[PDB]
Structures are given as structure tokens and as C-alpha cells.
Amino acid sequence: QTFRRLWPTIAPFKAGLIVAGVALILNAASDTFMLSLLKPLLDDGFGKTDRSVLVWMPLVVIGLMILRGITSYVSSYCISWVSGKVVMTMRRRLFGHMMGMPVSFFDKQSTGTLLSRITYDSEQVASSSSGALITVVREGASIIGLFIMMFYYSWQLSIILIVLAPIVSIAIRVVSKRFRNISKNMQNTMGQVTTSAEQMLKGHKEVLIFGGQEVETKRFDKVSNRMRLQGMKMVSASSISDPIIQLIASLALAFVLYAASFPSVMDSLTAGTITVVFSSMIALMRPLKSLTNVNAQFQRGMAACQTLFTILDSEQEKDEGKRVIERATGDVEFRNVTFTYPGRDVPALRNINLKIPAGKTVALVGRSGSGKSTIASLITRFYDIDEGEILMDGHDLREYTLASLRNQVALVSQNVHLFNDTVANNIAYARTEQYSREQIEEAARMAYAMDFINKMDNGLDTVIGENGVLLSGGQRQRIAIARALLRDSPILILDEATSALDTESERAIQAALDELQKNRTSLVIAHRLST
Amino acid sequence: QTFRRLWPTIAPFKAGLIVAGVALILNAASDTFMLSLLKPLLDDGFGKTDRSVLVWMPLVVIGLMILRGITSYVSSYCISWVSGKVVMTMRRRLFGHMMGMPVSFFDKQSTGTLLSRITYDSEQVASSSSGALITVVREGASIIGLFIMMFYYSWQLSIILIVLAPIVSIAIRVVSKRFRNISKNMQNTMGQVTTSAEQMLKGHKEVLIFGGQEVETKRFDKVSNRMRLQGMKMVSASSISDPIIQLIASLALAFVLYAASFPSVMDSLTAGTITVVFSSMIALMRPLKSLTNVNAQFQRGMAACQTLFTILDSEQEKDEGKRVIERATGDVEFRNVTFTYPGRDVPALRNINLKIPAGKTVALVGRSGSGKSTIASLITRFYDIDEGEILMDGHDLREYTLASLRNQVALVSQNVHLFNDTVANNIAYARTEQYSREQIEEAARMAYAMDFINKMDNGLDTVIGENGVLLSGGQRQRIAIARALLRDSPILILDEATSALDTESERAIQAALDELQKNRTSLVIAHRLST
């Protein structure tokens, strides 16, 4: 089905994948050929007792197994080539659209969800498609090979087991249908289990506060019981298959035994031939078992890949070209501003008009049910313009190049995110260059955060391995302030945190922000008194 | 190893594993017996051209596959009985000690970590141990019965393949050590990539603000290529495992044929017997490859189970025995109980050996690194105070009513992570104690929560599936206030935030809090001067 979208993404790499099947084909050869040697092994090695000829066979078996080996080698190798490269380009395009996704994309999801999606589902698409081809190639090779074996051995028993093939196959199909139909809603209750445990863990505070230990343990117990029972159902149903499969498969073999009646009274063949027939039967039963599950589970894979596409096929940041905006100061203007993050709410700014002049910064307004803070993120256009008007120097909504804005605007927040690099370069993120560490050094002096860097390792170029989680929030605030210093961004957004900081930290931040509001209009949210 | 710890937890269910092993031995019996009846085929059905046995044996095969079926039935069944029961009790005691876990030791890890621990590690211990037993028992019975088959057919070729098998096992041991090292490396590398991807994702806001997206793409692609190569080498080695095994196995078969040529002198065996030997040998090659990595795999399960035990055997909530069921009020009298949940900076706060006045509530004070809410958490003692106890009214941490401390001292919070139950009983989380739903209505009246009942279904007994995420935080705080009303806590703690609420909401809330401040000393996180 939706392979019409993958095959192109794989098309440049087709050749190697192709190679796989070739070797995979030889697998059956080996299999068949190994089984083939049974005829001379038995019917000639002891029918004719060519004791000497028996020395030919072993070297063959060895070579054939070596063929199995090398074939498996290249199978795994090229299949993994494809698997990787596909996962590669896939996750690349993901990362892309993730970037292209406006932050709204995160309003309806969580990080962990996207981590899971990207990593797991990516790997699963490739693993699926791979095993699909792997097994499919074997089916196209083992089945027909053993068929030819029986053919050049007995047209008759061939005919029989062929007439039997539909029977066993449809049996497998229907029992697999039973299986999957039982596996519809299990995920629901399993996630219910996980989520019950989850909410209890999250709420341990309230839990202890009320000490509902007994009630919650009772809940937990019912949950565990449902877990036990549904797991029982799962494993039972799944297990029954092979019996049922082999059971009816039995009769097939038994019907092959029923060749006692018809062709054996005609002295059908020799013993070793029949040994080949039955060994071949069992061989079939390996990929026979495969085929159906192949179709099903790899349809599942392709469906996961369809989910992936939908994530990609989802619309990126809706930008018809925010044109070109030169870096500039100017003034911020609020003409008839109204905005609702979802439709769930009413206009956050209820038709509000404001003017924030050049360099004349503006602090956290004091109000009730404001939320302007997130509205600053909309001044950064992280979500969609809902209504109203936010103007920059006589220019309407989307004359505003996202890149140009994020350059010219700045954001300082209580929340700060760090990145496993040199914290200096983490500041330098504006192309990570064009700003000598010397300039970064003086910024740190202006950031007043070099004091912490003294405690930090790797000196002035502190490489924050695993981000150096020990780095306090206010340190990160000074970090972002230094970043702003490097960007000379005419527009700033600020925030005051109070987790654990010192008079030196807060007051040096005050001074820094003071210089920042100069020549560059700032937006602030603070808990101080006069400010 | 720690089976010394598991075997008791399973002992009430020995019979399960017992009948499991019985069935598994019967399964091996079925296998061996099919392979055996292979012989009389060639003995008479082609040697003497018999039909009698040529019809007998069909029915035999049928019944024997039915035995495979029923054996698999009870195997899966009882083994799952045990797996479940174990997981059940395991997760049970895991909740238990998990409730007796200090809040700090939560904050040592993350919630998701514990979710994974419980769910996965439980079911993984189960699956591991189960498959371990299944294998060891099947494998053993299969190998021994096949040995017997060869024995009553050829002392000689038996002897040979006996001498041979250890070599196979050693080759497998080597490849499994390769597995060990490549596996630890693979775990390291996949941890790396998931960390990088996530840490990039979370920063989307900042990533945009700096708009360095190309750099993120670069890092993404680097780690992607690293993953490509890592998985490449991983699957490479894991594949290469098989061919080496099958190759040396082939060499073994070759020696078997060298044998066939050496008693080619005597030529005692029958084509049947030959077929039996080789078929059985391939059989072996299934359980051998299994059992080796099985005896390896004990650890995996037992390793996770040891982690579990450590969680159990970790420091549960250590109280010298709190007791004190009776309720009252008295007053609060802290006795130097230290703060250093994460021992990083230094120990700082109030240090009062003093006492707190009755009736009068408690508000919020502003100081650097005050940590009031968590200082309140220690005031509530539900977080582990680092040192000492608390002689309240001359009565220690437990001499004053610790468990009842929850009843005596209320803990309202801004974020009320509620539970997937009836909002009515959500108020009665504390093991509903004949809090008449009439009292629920009247409290919601005293709380001014009756309006949110209209927002919900299920009459005045509103129920919230998935907590009814529709509910905004403010009315949940109001619910918790009503709960405090129900528990008639003379002492309380409250919480005021400013995420999103209305004027009338905050007003009626502060009215209800005054009522709570009335004749009940509380601790109130607030942004106002009402206190």
C-alpha cells in the first residue's frame, strides 16, 4: 500500500537490498541441496552401499553450510545498510518537520511521546520491512525448491502435498485471525495499568497527605489481577496456535502417510526419497508458519510508517515567506490585540492596545487572569496569530521573518535549556561562530557568571558534559543574558526566578538588564516591588 | 544467586512449575518418539513393504502432535499462572516499599524511571525466569532422550557426537562473550543517541529563538550516523554468531560421516538408524544453541530482580514507631530537623527549638533560598528531614501523632494531581469514613465548588475518567479545600498560584480559606496580604 512513499526513499539504495534476496535465494538451495543429498545418502549410500562415494557428501555439506553462512552475512549486512539509511533519512526529515512544526505541535503531545515515536517507530519500520523481505524471499525460495525436489522425485506425492497446502495455509490464516482478534483491546487495559501506577507515583504527596495506602493498595491489587488475567488470555491464545497449526498440519503429513494406500501399493518410491519428502514438509512448515504472520505484522509495520508520514505530512510552520526584515530597533505596537491559544478560551488580551517605544522597556503587567507571558511567546510567533494586531514599525503580521525576529528578539526565562557542548559555544549559538571567545569572555564578565565558571571545569571554555546539571538556574539566566549581549537584539523578553540565588546574582542581573533595556527595548516579568 | 530470595516467593506455587516440567519432558518424549517411529518406516514400510505399521504410525504421529499440543497448553498455562502470580506479588510489595519510600528517593529518580522499573522489570523477570525454566527442562529432556535413541541404535556414532558437542558449546560460549561486550557498548551508544535527540527536542523554544536549526540538524545527523554504524556492527556480530555455530556443527556432521565410513567396514546400522542420527543431531542443534545463552540469560532476569530487591531492601520510611492514633491540635514545636535532600550547597533555614502559636495561621515570607514550600514539606514531615525528630508540644516526631499528623495537619497544594475515581470520593481519598455525600455538597458550598459539578456529568457524584483533564487547577485546589473541611484538620497548609483563575474564583477561595484560617491554624502559600 503506502510503499508508494517508501520505495522512493529507498530507491537509491535498491541495489544492495536486491543483493540480499539473491543470497537469500541460495539459502533455500542449501536447504534443498542439503536435503537433496539425503537421496544419495540413503538410497545410494546404503541402497547401493557406495561407501567410498560417502566421502564426497561431507565436503559438500560443509560448503553448503558455508554458503548458508556467507548468505546470512550479506543478508544481514545489506539489509542493515538499508535499514539504517532509511531510519537515517527518516529521522532527518523528522527533525526537520519537528523544527518546521510550530510549538503548537507540542500543545497536543509530550516530549516522551515524540522520543518514542522517532526512535522506536523509526527502528520498527526498517526492522519490519527487512524481516518482511527476508521471510518473503525464503518463502519464494524454500517453498518452490522443495516443490521441485518432490517433483523430480514424485509427481504423485507432490500433487498430494500441493492439494494439502491450501488447507494448512488457510488454517494458519484463520487461527492467526483468532489470535489478532483477541489482541484488540488489551493495549487499553495495559495502558490503564501503567497509568494507574503512574498517577499513584505522581501523587505520592497527596497520597501520604491522606494516607490512602490501603485504598490505593486495593486499587493496585485489582489492577494487578486484571494484568494477570489479560496476560493469561494473551499467552494462552497465542500459544494454542502451534498446536492447532501442527495438529491439522499433522493430518497433512498423515495424508502424505496415506500415500500408503495409493502409490505405495504401486511401489511409489524409495525410502530416502520419502525421508526427503517429510523433511521438506517440515521445512515448509517453517516458512509456512511465516507467510501469514509476515503479511500481518509487516502491514503493522507499514501502518506505523504511515503514522510517521502523517507526522511528517502534518503542516509545518505556516509561512508564506515572512519576507525580509533588516535588524532594527523600532517600537512594538498592540493594535486591538486578541488571542486564544486553543479555541477553549476567550481572547487572552481582551482587545488591548499598547505602545512600547524604542529602548523604553516594559515590565510584567500586574493583573488578574492575564497570561501575557505566553503571549510573549506569541510575540515570538511560536503559535499562530489568532486575532488582533501586533505591529513592528508600520509592518503587519507576517512581514516578519522568523529568523530575523529570533535574531532581533531575545528571551530570558526562569526556565532555561542547556545543551551538551561547551557552555561558551552554547551561548554562541548564533551560528556558533563570528563571536570570539574573547568577546564571549567579556560577555561573561558582563554576564557576571564567570564566578561559577571558576567552579566549573575546562576553564573559560567549560565543556558541560551532560550539561553539568549542577549549574544553577540563575547561572543559566546570566548565560542567556550574555547570549543577548552577543546578539545585540533590539528586542528582549525577561523573567525573574527565585529558586536559589544570591544578592550578588540578582543585583548583577539587575544591572545587566538595565544595560540591556538601553538601545534595546525589553519585555520583563518580575516579582520585585517597584519594578 | 538471589533465587535464594525468589524461590520462597514462588514456593506457594511449586506445583505449577512441577507440572510444567512434566509436560515439557512429555514434549521431548513426543519429539524423540516421532524421530524414532521414523525408523520403522524404513525398517518395514520400505524394507519389508509393510502396510500395517504404515497405517499404525500415522495415527501415532497424530496422537504425538496432539501431545505436543496439550503439553504446550499446560506449559504456557501454568508457567503463566506463576509468571502472573510472581509479577503480582512483586509489584505489590514494590508498591508497599514504594509507599514507604522517602520523597527524596523518588526525586533521586524520575517517575518514568519507576514506571519502567515496575512494569518492565517485573514482566521481564517473569519472562526471563519462565523461558529459562522452559528451556533448561525441555533442552535437558530432549538431549537425553535423543542420546538414548542414538544409544539403542549406535553406541559408536553416539560416542562420537558426544565427544563433539562440547566443542560446539565452547564456540557458543565465545560468541556469547562477544555478545556481552558488543551489548554493553550498544546500550551505551543507544543511551547516547536517545539523550541527544531528546535534549535537542525539549529545547525547541530556545532552538527557535537562536534559530540555529542547521546546527541541530548537524548534531542530529552525526548521532544518526553513529547509530547507523553501531546497529550495523551490532546486527553484524549477532548474525555472524549463527554461521560459525552451524559451521562447526557441520564439521561435527562431517566427523559423523567419517564415522559412517569407518564402520563402513562392519556396516551394522540401517538407513533408518542413519536418518535418525542426523535428524536427532539437528534437533540437538536447536536446544544446544538455546541452553547456552539460556544459562547466560539467568543473570538478565535475576539482575533486574536484584535491582528490584535493592528497591525493596532500600531504606523504607524509617520511623522508630510513630503510632499515636488519637487526634487533637496542641501546637507545633520543631526540634532542629536539617535540610539537604540533595546534599549539594550547604544546610540553611530557620533553626528554632521554639514553638508555634495556636489559632494563628501561617503565610509566606520572602528570603533568599527560603525554600518555604519544601520547608513546609518538612513542617509536614512527609519529606525526610535529614536529622533528628520533632518534639511537638514536648512530643517527638512520633510521640506527637505522626500518621495522624496527616489528619491533624492538612496539606493543600496548588497542583492537585487527583486520581481516576469519582470526584465525590476524590474528596474522600482518605478511605471514605462515612463522609456523607451531603457533607460533600455542603463543603463544595463552603468551598464554592458546586458550580464545577455542573461542568461534570454523573449528577452530584461526578466521576472523572482519566481525571477529567477538563478540570482546571483552581477548582481542584477548591476540592482539596473542601476535603480539608471534611477532615476537620485543626492544622493545615494551603497553596496559591497564578497559572489561570478568575477574580470571583480567587475571591470565594480566599473566603473559604479565611473560614479555614478561622479557628484552624494553617500555612498559606500566597501572593496577597490577607494575612
Numbering used by the authors:
A (entry chain A), B (entry chain B): 11 to 541
Quote the paper.
Using Escherichia coli MsbA, we show that peptidiscs stabilize this ABC transporter as effectively as MSP-based lipid nanodiscs. Image processing revealed subtle conformational variability in the distance between the two NBDs, as illustrated by the two final density maps at resolutions of 4.2 and 4.4 Å. The slight mobility of the NBDs in the nucleotide-free state is the likely reason for the somewhat limited resolution of our maps as well as the previously published cryo-EM map of MsbA in nanodiscs (also 4.2 Å). Like in the nanodisc-stabilized MsbA, our map showed clear density for LPS trapped in the transporter, which was not visible in any of the X-ray crystal structures of detergent-solubilized MsbA . The differing number of segments identified in the two maps somewhat exaggerates the actual difference in the MsbA surface covered by peptides in the two maps, because longer segments in one map occasionally overlap with more than one shorter segment in the other map. For example, the longest helical segment in the map of conformation 1 overlaps with three shorter segments in the map of conformation 2. Overall, most of the helical segments overlap completely or at least partially between the two maps, as can be seen on the front face of the MsbA dimer. However, the side face of the MsbA dimer reveals differences between the surface coverage of the transmembrane domain by the peptidisc peptides, with the map of conformation 2 showing two helical segments that are not seen in the map of conformation 1 (red arrows).
Recently, our laboratory introduced the peptidisc as a novel type of peptide scaffold designed to keep membrane proteins stable in solution without detergent.
